[PDB]
Amino acid sequence: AMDIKCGSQAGGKLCPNNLCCSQWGFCGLGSEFCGGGCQSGACST
Numbered sequence: 001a002m003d004i005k006c007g008s009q010a011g012g013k014l015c016p017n018n019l020c021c022s023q024w025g026f027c028g029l030g031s032e033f034c035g036g037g038c039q040s041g042a043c044s045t
Contacts, residue, residue, distance in 0.1 A: 006021040006027060007021035007039030007040055018041055019042065020041045020042050021038060021039035021040040022038070023036070029042065
């Protein structure tokens with residue numbers, strides 16, 4: 001599956017597209033990526 005990483009896991013790199021960097025460092029959207037612990041991208045906080 002798609003498994004590109006970013007954030008704390010990548011040592012402070014962003015997603016290539018505007019995706020939410022999850023808790024686990026992977027890019028995506030919705031409550032599973034942006035919903036709490038969102039490191040970079042389309043995050044609320």
